[PDB]
Design a protein around this motif. Sequence first.
Motif, PDB file in Angstrom:
ATOM      1  N   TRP C  29       0.750  -1.087  -0.119  1.00 34.19           N
ATOM      2  CA  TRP C  29       0.013  -0.007  -0.033  1.00 34.19           C
ATOM      3  C   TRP C  29       0.923   1.370   0.035  1.00 34.19           C
ATOM      4  O   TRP C  29       0.336   2.290  -0.341  1.00 34.19           O
ATOM      5  CB  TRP C  29      -0.885   0.161   1.344  1.00 34.19           C
ATOM      6  N   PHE C  94      -7.535   7.831  -4.733  1.00 37.77           N
ATOM      7  CA  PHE C  94      -8.738   7.495  -3.793  1.00 37.77           C
ATOM      8  C   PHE C  94      -7.941   6.551  -2.851  1.00 37.77           C
ATOM      9  O   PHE C  94      -8.426   6.101  -1.687  1.00 37.77           O
ATOM     10  CB  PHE C  94      -9.822   6.772  -4.556  1.00 37.77           C
ATOM     11  N   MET C  95      -7.309   5.566  -3.381  1.00 36.26           N
ATOM     12  CA  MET C  95      -6.725   4.466  -2.558  1.00 36.26           C
ATOM     13  C   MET C  95      -5.408   4.795  -1.918  1.00 36.26           C
ATOM     14  O   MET C  95      -5.032   4.271  -0.676  1.00 36.26           O
ATOM     15  CB  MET C  95      -6.319   3.457  -3.473  1.00 36.26           C
ATOM     16  N   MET C  97      -5.375   8.110  -0.343  1.00 34.12           N
ATOM     17  CA  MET C  97      -5.624   8.662   0.726  1.00 34.12           C
ATOM     18  C   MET C  97      -6.498   8.045   1.833  1.00 34.12           C
ATOM     19  O   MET C  97      -6.452   8.134   2.917  1.00 34.12           O
ATOM     20  CB  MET C  97      -6.892   9.963   0.342  1.00 34.12           C
ATOM     21  N   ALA C  98      -7.051   6.843   1.335  1.00 34.57           N
ATOM     22  CA  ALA C  98      -7.790   5.787   2.059  1.00 34.57           C
ATOM     23  C   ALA C  98      -6.694   4.967   3.044  1.00 34.57           C
ATOM     24  O   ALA C  98      -7.177   4.655   4.060  1.00 34.57           O
ATOM     25  CB  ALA C  98      -8.570   4.893   1.255  1.00 34.57           C
ATOM     26  N   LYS C  99      -5.563   4.689   2.529  1.00 33.39           N
ATOM     27  CA  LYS C  99      -4.769   4.112   3.394  1.00 33.39           C
ATOM     28  C   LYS C  99      -4.045   5.088   4.514  1.00 33.39           C
ATOM     29  O   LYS C  99      -3.985   4.831   5.563  1.00 33.39           O
ATOM     30  CB  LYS C  99      -3.064   4.078   2.483  1.00 33.39           C
ATOM     31  N   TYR C 102      -6.296   5.011   7.458  1.00 32.91           N
ATOM     32  CA  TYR C 102      -6.265   3.695   8.097  1.00 32.91           C
ATOM     33  C   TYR C 102      -5.048   3.789   8.986  1.00 32.91           C
ATOM     34  O   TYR C 102      -5.393   3.714  10.160  1.00 32.91           O
ATOM     35  CB  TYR C 102      -6.331   2.676   7.047  1.00 32.91           C
ATOM     36  N   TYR C 103      -3.894   3.740   8.498  1.00 33.19           N
ATOM     37  CA  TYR C 103      -2.717   3.682   9.189  1.00 33.19           C
ATOM     38  C   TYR C 103      -2.687   5.086  10.046  1.00 33.19           C
ATOM     39  O   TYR C 103      -1.765   5.162  10.815  1.00 33.19           O
ATOM     40  CB  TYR C 103      -1.702   3.187   8.273  1.00 33.19           C
ATOM     41  N   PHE C 121      -5.631  17.752  -3.681  1.00 30.73           N
ATOM     42  CA  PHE C 121      -7.140  17.131  -4.076  1.00 30.73           C
ATOM     43  C   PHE C 121      -7.998  18.012  -4.655  1.00 30.73           C
ATOM     44  O   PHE C 121      -8.754  17.750  -5.417  1.00 30.73           O
ATOM     45  CB  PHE C 121      -7.519  16.163  -2.998  1.00 30.73           C
ATOM     46  N   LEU C 302     -11.720  17.039   5.972  1.00 34.47           N
ATOM     47  CA  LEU C 302     -10.353  16.350   6.233  1.00 34.47           C
ATOM     48  C   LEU C 302      -9.334  17.190   7.270  1.00 34.47           C
ATOM     49  O   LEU C 302      -8.865  16.381   7.986  1.00 34.47           O
ATOM     50  CB  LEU C 302      -9.766  15.620   5.090  1.00 34.47           C
ATOM     51  N   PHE C 326     -14.317   2.363   9.697  1.00 33.96           N
ATOM     52  CA  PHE C 326     -13.689   2.429   8.368  1.00 33.96           C
ATOM     53  C   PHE C 326     -14.157   2.068   6.852  1.00 33.96           C
ATOM     54  O   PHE C 326     -14.404   2.600   6.130  1.00 33.96           O
ATOM     55  CB  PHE C 326     -12.204   2.066   8.540  1.00 33.96           C
ATOM     56  N   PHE C 327     -14.912   0.943   7.126  1.00 31.86           N
ATOM     57  CA  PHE C 327     -15.504   0.382   6.163  1.00 31.86           C
ATOM     58  C   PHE C 327     -17.003   0.614   5.768  1.00 31.86           C
ATOM     59  O   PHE C 327     -17.742   0.245   5.011  1.00 31.86           O
ATOM     60  CB  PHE C 327     -15.415  -1.253   6.270  1.00 31.86           C
ATOM     61  N   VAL C 330     -16.403   3.588   3.750  1.00 32.07           N
ATOM     62  CA  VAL C 330     -15.887   3.275   2.273  1.00 32.07           C
ATOM     63  C   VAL C 330     -17.078   3.003   1.436  1.00 32.07           C
ATOM     64  O   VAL C 330     -17.320   3.614   0.287  1.00 32.07           O
ATOM     65  CB  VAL C 330     -14.858   2.185   2.257  1.00 32.07           C
ATOM     66  N   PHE C 333     -19.048   6.039   0.320  1.00 35.24           N
ATOM     67  CA  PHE C 333     -18.641   6.848  -0.773  1.00 35.24           C
ATOM     68  C   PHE C 333     -18.964   6.181  -2.237  1.00 35.24           C
ATOM     69  O   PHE C 333     -18.939   6.913  -3.226  1.00 35.24           O
ATOM     70  CB  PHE C 333     -17.297   7.063  -0.584  1.00 35.24           C
ATOM     71  N   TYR C 359     -21.559  11.186   5.913  1.00 38.81           N
ATOM     72  CA  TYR C 359     -20.452  11.583   5.463  1.00 38.81           C
ATOM     73  C   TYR C 359     -19.469  12.643   6.497  1.00 38.81           C
ATOM     74  O   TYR C 359     -18.398  12.965   6.409  1.00 38.81           O
ATOM     75  CB  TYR C 359     -20.392  12.235   4.074  1.00 38.81           C
TER      76      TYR C 359
END
Lengths: 62, 54, 385, 385, 51, 126, 126, 49
Positions: C29, C94-95, C97-99, C102-103, C121, C302, C326-327, C330, C333, C359
Amino acid sequence: KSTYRTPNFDDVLKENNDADKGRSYAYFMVGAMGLLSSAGAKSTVETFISSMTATADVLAMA
Amino acid sequence: SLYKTFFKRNAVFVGTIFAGAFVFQTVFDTAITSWYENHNKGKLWKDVKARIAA
Amino acid sequence: MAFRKSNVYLSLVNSYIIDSPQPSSINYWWNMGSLLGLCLVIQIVTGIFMAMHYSSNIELAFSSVEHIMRDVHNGYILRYLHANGASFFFMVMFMHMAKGLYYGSYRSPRVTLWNVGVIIFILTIATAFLGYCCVYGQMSHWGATVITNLFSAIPFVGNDIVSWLWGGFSVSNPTIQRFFALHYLVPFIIAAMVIMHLMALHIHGSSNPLGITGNLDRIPMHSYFIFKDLVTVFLFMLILALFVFYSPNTLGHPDNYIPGNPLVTPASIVPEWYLLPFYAILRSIPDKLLGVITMFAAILVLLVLPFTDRSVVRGNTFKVLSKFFFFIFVFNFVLLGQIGACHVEVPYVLMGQIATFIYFAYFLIIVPVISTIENVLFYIGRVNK
Amino acid sequence: MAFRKSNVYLSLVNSYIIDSPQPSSINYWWNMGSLLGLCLVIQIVTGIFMAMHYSSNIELAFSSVEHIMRDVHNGYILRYLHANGASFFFMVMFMHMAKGLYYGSYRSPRVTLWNVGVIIFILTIATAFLGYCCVYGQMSHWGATVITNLFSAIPFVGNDIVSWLWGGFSVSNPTIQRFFALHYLVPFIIAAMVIMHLMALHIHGSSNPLGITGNLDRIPMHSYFIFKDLVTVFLFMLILALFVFYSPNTLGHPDNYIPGNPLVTPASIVPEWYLLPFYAILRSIPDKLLGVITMFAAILVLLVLPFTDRSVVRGNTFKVLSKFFFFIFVFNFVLLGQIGACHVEVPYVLMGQIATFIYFAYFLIIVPVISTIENVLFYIGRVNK
Amino acid sequence: TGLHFGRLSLRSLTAYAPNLMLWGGASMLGLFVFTEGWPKFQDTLYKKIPL
Amino acid sequence: PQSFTSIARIGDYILKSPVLSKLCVPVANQFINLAGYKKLGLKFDDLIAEENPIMQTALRRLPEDESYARAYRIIRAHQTELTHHLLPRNEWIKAQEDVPYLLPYILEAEAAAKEKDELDNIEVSK
Amino acid sequence: PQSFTSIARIGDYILKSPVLSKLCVPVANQFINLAGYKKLGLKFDDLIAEENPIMQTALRRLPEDESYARAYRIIRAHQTELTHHLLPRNEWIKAQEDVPYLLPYILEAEAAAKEKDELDNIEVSK
Amino acid sequence: PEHDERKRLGLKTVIILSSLYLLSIWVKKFKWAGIKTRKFVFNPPKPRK
Ligand SMILES: CCCCCCCCCCC(=O)OC[C@H](COP(=O)(O)OC[C@H](O)COP(=O)(O)OC[C@@H](COC(=O)CC)OC(=O)CCC)OC(=O)CCCCCCCC
Ligand SMILES: CCCCCCCCCCC(=O)OC[C@H](COP(=O)(O)OC[C@H](O)COP(=O)(O)OC[C@@H](COC(=O)CC)OC(=O)CCC)OC(=O)CCCCCCCC
Ligand SMILES: CCCCCCCCCCCCCCCCCC(=O)OC[C@H](COP(=O)(O)OCCN)OC(=O)CCCCCCCCCCCCC
Ligand code: HEM
Ligand code: HEM
Ligand code: HEM
Ligand code: HEM
Ligand SMILES: COc1c(O)c(C)c(C/C=C(/C)CC/C=C(\C)CC/C=C(\C)CC/C=C(\C)CC/C=C(\C)CCC=C(C)C)c(O)c1OC
Ligand SMILES: COc1c(O)c(C)c(C/C=C(\C)CC/C=C(\C)CC/C=C(/C)CC/C=C(/C)CC/C=C(\C)CCC=C(C)C)c(O)c1OC
Ligand SMILES: CCCCCCCCCCCCCCC(=O)OCCCOP(=O)(O)OC[C@@H](O)COP(=O)(O)OCCCOC(C)=O
Ligand SMILES: CCCCCCCCCCCCCCC(=O)O[C@H](COC(=O)CCCCCCCCCCCC)COP(=O)(O)O
Ligand SMILES: CCCCCCCCCCCCCCCCCC(=O)O[C@H](COC(=O)CCCCCC)COP(=O)(O)OCCN
Ligand SMILES: CCCCCCCCCCCCCCCCCC(=O)O[C@H](COC(=O)CCCCCC)COP(=O)(O)OCCN
Ligand SMILES: Cc1cc(C)c2nc(SCc3c(C)cccc3-n3nnn(C)c3=O)sc2c1
Ligand SMILES: Cc1cc(C)c2nc(SCc3c(C)cccc3-n3nnn(C)c3=O)sc2c1
């Protein structure tokens, strides 16, 4: 225990450790992955410089 | 021997990866511009410009 | 010392992509940020070659895109790359910013890294709007009409902002000639914000999937993460090949192959798929002043996330209630993107109203309540009192 | 420490324009490098506003410049600034490079500073050519014809380089649509070469008019050299006002107010005044392969000057034979510019032949002979033997 | 003792040379890579005996 | 940033309450095993972020026999992650040795910080 | 970068020659006054660029009573330049005190550099 | 009008790149063999330390 007693690596080790066994197959594969990346990278730079040539409706007015 | 033939010499390892790529493009373009033709026959222009010969 | 750490310019290359100390524990990731440096190189390079055959007048715009596709040598390779590549630019971002949420890297000491990323963005959404208005198809006329009409709701300022944004009284010929000149410039402002983005990373490094410090076990960049980089770069250009040569018109609208007409209106006006969740938030508020405020204060929500996390552990690895939420964020969105391509009907107005509240309840009500319950549950599960 | 030296980005501002240690002895010739950061901001900003009203087709090019000048609100302010400002861009840069070879800064340890400066001078000549071909006047057609015809003299390569540079068989419509798209880009490559140019200055600082070291007496940048900066910035914009409002067409050719015609030829084809000394060098060699080699190897003769100075003192302050040959090189660049606006006649072909030899005997025969005679004359004038 | 070098260490005279006859067989061979698709002086490439 | 002082204020009130600590303590135990940090060979006080000037104080005051054994639990966990496996069940921390070794050094570095600011914003009168 | 070994090789040959040193020595004297470096309060060895590893060696070996008096002649010259005036004629270096104080330390830092390279490029045979 | 030309150049690249992607998984997991098999052992120091 002591630091002069290494752990066992024979679960991952080869049985005949000739030096040229892994020195050939690790240069055939890095040799093959620098041959397709030299022909697959001359064709991309050439596609972008073929577009600046004479356009198809300009060759009709020749 | 085999390792010191063409893998020790980087001047070869830059040369032969460049020299091999010159003949690579030509034996491979011809090999696929004869598979695309033979897979699609009776649908090209050269095929139907031979039954309109009358 | 060697020459690569003695030179003025090579030591900038050496401190970033050769001898930069990386953690030993990062997974695949942490590669999405490397693709975005390649994604931005592709979109700039293919666009300068397509700008040699383009005319930005309103009576020539839907004929210079076709002159490229039928007359220019390999001109269909250039366009299909610059229209499927921008939709590949967004799936990685999108992947990315989603990482990072999460971390949870947004935390201290990386808050400037998160704040200069929100600016990127905003400027990325603006280029994809300004360039999709340069085709001048039928979706390209009624998309610029709906968006620029929102700036008339500003009280005492409105109809003197739209008439300055239009250069006239509707979406005229000066509207298309100013949107191309701004399409060339903002990709060069993004590249200067990426250079500032990498500077704030060099002073603290990356995080790790464990969350804890990683200054006890490190590995240099060369020979390990460069050969881990090329696994995903060859996968990127392989799925960028299965679209540009086999399905080049799946991510697009067929109405953009009709020239734009200010007199006939389409049966549906819907955006490109990556502006669809932000479209359902604007249409959900039944006022054109409180609708344009809400959609702009949904990219800028954000920035309140560094001040709203109340936990002492970084990242959602060992947090099992902060992973279930978190899910939910997801798939909310995704439901928001689906509704922005529907009709204004029942029940797609109450579904887009509840789901634009989730949201906002995430960043402000769901985060600080659940990141406080966990701090007590990690405490009374251990302390014998 | 304070906040200006603790922040990531403010310490970049603090290390360059606030607390940078400057020598106490520098005079008003060290200000020309500051005007060029303002000169480049003006030319980019006025050009993005003029790119909103421009059409790059060959049948619309000499009508979008006039639509700017009579219909656009204050459009004559934008154009006259972007046509007298570029001639102000070059008068400062001719005085910037002339200082740096008087004080002789090209020497060790500043050779990378001199080499990245020669790259900027090549890319600056190329933008002023590509943008003067976008007006499509009568000088704008026959100037692109003469220059692009030189690339046919390359043996076995020639007529496949010009036909790729033209997009056809002469200076056609694809020639003007590709010259505007390259005019937008190369000003953004110059700005990235100026950032690399400032980095090589931060590690060694500036020189001084004495030549000797200046680490014993230093002054910060703020309150002394910022208030010495604004003396020349207010003088710059005052003579940039006496042209744009009182004589806006003195630095220009009247033939550029006729639309370009590939069938009638003008009685004289002469360049803009800052490409005139390089024009007389091309016309002086009676071969179109040895003429295009000579003019390109006259901007690249500056790189041999670090290896040709044989003196032990830096700068021409106390050197009275190396000062008489600096002012022969100056008035030879003026006589070369005068001849490039003359007719090909007698004696303006033998005068442009001798004076293009003195352009080359300076860097290769005049410098190392005179910078060696002085090393002995500073020795036997002192040593009693 | 007072022998051949200037700014180069000239003890590498042919300790630099015969391998850059083969880097010259790897960089002029690099110009045998990018000359494709540009059928202008590629008559100097396409006379080889196979394919 | 939710202050340990405040975590311990709420946490002691649940542990003193005999009717609240039959509701929250089994939920606190399933939350620990489902976190799974013991299987990587780590106690809970290893997980705490150390990038603030209170956790940097509480790590210097730690004894050196405990400071060396914690640098090994971190390195053993970075290698278990890279190979994508888990440690054997002979190297898992049991439910008795997972104790706070850092909470005494934390709670007194905070109470000394809540006296230096109370004595610098003060309205004494004559 | 001409070398003082080479400057002194040519310079001694003119000074030993009795017919050459009636042609070059008056030209060497008008070249010194027209340089004008004495009016700023400087000797000639102050003017030499010091950004190479031979002049950095020859400055460390200089005695400290001379190393302090040279740092003042430089600072006094940076201030005469800034005010655009000249020093009075009581603070000009005369024609007797302008002597090379740095040439002995320079000529032996060069001869030791022309032995370390001659001994590393060498073709001894048996 | 490019439909037959496009699908022919659509086999020059997906044969080169799908083979170039398979080599980078062999090459990566060869140079990543030392790090994945390192061992560690803790002998605690003497109780002065
Ligand atoms: C538009 C897209 C352009 C292309 C960009 C692709 C984006 C990829 C992002 C997904 C990702 O990075 O997650 C990584 C996830 C596993 O996480 P991990 O790093 O701990 O496991 C490392 C492994 O054990 C060692 O992998 P190893 O190095 O041993 O082999 C490499 C592997 C594939 O390499 C990759 O690049 C995977 C992305 O080769 C093979 O499997 C052989 C196949 C013939 O890998 C997965 O398989 C999870 C898939 C679910 C993700 C779906 C999300 C999409 C929205
Ligand atoms: C189109 C381009 C316009 C761009 C803006 C103008 C560019 C200016 C470039 C000229 C230059 O930089 O040379 C500066 C040089 C000054 O020498 P110096 O620094 O040793 O003495 C400082 C003084 O004692 C204190 O000057 P002070 O600070 O006390 O007074 C202010 C000063 C005006 O400030 C300036 O900016 C002068 C350029 O007052 C004046 O000096 C009156 C002049 C109007 O002046 C001279 O020596 C004159 C040489 C003639 C220049 C020929 C140029 C050929 C093109
Ligand atoms: C401003 C607004 C911001 C909007 C940004 C939100 C965009 C959402 C778009 C979804 C794409 C992002 C997918 C999630 C990527 C980040 C997740 C991550 O970083 O990793 C989490 C998890 C890692 O799990 P581990 O690998 O650590 O498991 C090992 C066990 N110890 O990884 C996993 O477990 C894999 C789970 C994969 C979930 C797939 C969901 C993606 C669905 C995409 C639908 C696409 C429709 C177009
Ligand atoms: C971050 C960088 C960029 C992004 C995300 C982007 C995105 C887009 C998108 C999505 C389109 C619509 C494509 C379509 O549907 O036909 C477009 C059109 C266009 N863009 Fe780009 N672009 C970028 C950079 C550039 C740059 C730097 C140029 C410079 C010339 C450029 C030139 C064009 C042109 C000429 C069009 C015309 C329509 C066409 O040819 O398809 N783009 N851009
Ligand atoms: C063109 C756009 C971008 C580029 C080139 C880029 C590049 C990078 C790179 C190379 C990294 C290094 C770590 C990694 O590779 O994962 C990184 C990290 C990061 N980026 Fe981006 N990024 C972009 C957009 C964004 C955006 C839009 C955001 C947030 C809104 C963002 C936030 C972050 C954060 C927080 C990190 C640190 C993650 C960590 O170290 O754990 N970036 N970025
Ligand atoms: C280093 C920066 C630049 C230089 C030296 C430069 C120079 C010039 C010059 C000399 C002309 C001819 C003016 C005339 O005689 O009419 C010109 C024309 C033009 N340039 Fe610039 N330029 C620069 C930057 C730019 C940029 C970045 C753009 C685009 C945003 C631009 C847009 C134009 C346009 C549209 C014209 C059209 C003709 C006119 O309006 O006069 N320029 N440029
Ligand atoms: C857009 C063009 C340029 C910009 C913005 C620029 C900027 C600067 C600045 C700000 C300085 C320091 C202040 C000063 O010394 O006056 C400087 C110094 C210098 N520049 Fe430039 N410059 C440009 C073009 C050039 C060119 C074309 C050359 C040489 C061919 C050059 C060579 C130098 C050198 C050698 C110095 C150091 C002078 C010294 O420190 O004594 N520059 N430049
Ligand atoms: C030796 O000591 C010195 C020193 O003496 C001096 C003078 C300076 C200062 C000198 C300078 C020349 C300043 C530095 C120069 C720059 C930062 C110039 C580079 C920046 C640019 C060229 C910016 C270009 C402008 C833009 C990109 C703006 C784009 C236009 C827009 C967005 C308008 C369009 C918007 C709309 C809505 C239409 C030093 O920095 C310095 O230390 C090294
Ligand atoms: C975490 O560890 C990492 C890391 O993983 C990575 C990948 C990087 C690598 C850095 C990046 C990937 C950043 C990416 C940088 C960019 C995207 C900047 C590129 C910007 C541009 C504007 C490039 C495009 C420039 C041009 C001039 C376009 C080309 C146009 C041409 C040549 C015109 C063609 C016409 C003719 C006539 C030739 C790191 O630095 C790093 O350490 C922090
Ligand atoms: C009043 C005056 C006007 C006001 C002006 C304001 C103040 C003026 C000060 C000017 C500041 C200039 C300072 C220069 C600067 O910004 O430094 C560069 C920033 C450091 O970051 P970076 O390393 O460039 O980015 C990170 C980069 O180094 C990333 O590089 P990488 O991608 O790793 O390598 C390149 C690719 C090579 O890849 C290959 C081919 O292998
Ligand atoms: C800056 C680069 C942007 C383009 C990359 C985008 C990749 C995804 C789409 C593929 C476009 C390629 C078009 C096909 C073509 O032009 O040639 C095609 C076929 O060539 C190929 O198969 C090359 C495929 C491999 C490309 C990816 C490998 C990357 C290697 C490093 C490149 C760095 C410069 C024309 O073939 P031809 O030689 O007969 O003219
Ligand atoms: C921040 C945005 C600015 C854009 C990117 C910034 C730079 C990123 C890296 C770009 C690649 C730079 C690599 C170049 C390496 C060249 C080696 C070198 O510089 O040798 C230089 C000489 O280079 C030059 O003459 C000018 C080259 C212009 C470079 C233009 C690209 C000499 O190196 P040096 O003097 O330090 O060696 C002494 C060893 N005792
Ligand atoms: C641009 C070319 C690259 C060349 C080198 C870059 C030169 C730097 C340009 C000078 C920038 C000056 C910035 C000074 C202020 C920074 C304060 C700060 O640290 O903000 C940080 C983060 O905010 C930012 O990202 C702003 C970045 C500024 C970038 C402008 C788009 C602290 O944020 P803040 O104080 O607002 O508190 C958080 C509340 N939201
Ligand atoms: C902050 C911000 C800025 C902008 C500028 C923006 N714009 C949109 S939606 C535009 C649209 C519509 C409404 C209908 C059809 C097509 C398109 N359209 N226009 N460009 N693209 C890629 C599209 O899909 S939300 C948004 C948010
Ligand atoms: C390296 C290099 C590059 C270029 C590109 C270049 N070009 C010229 S001269 C062009 C010219 C002519 C011959 C006659 C009339 C007008 C113009 N002309 N074209 N643009 N400008 C500003 C002009 O004055 S020398 C030169 C040198």
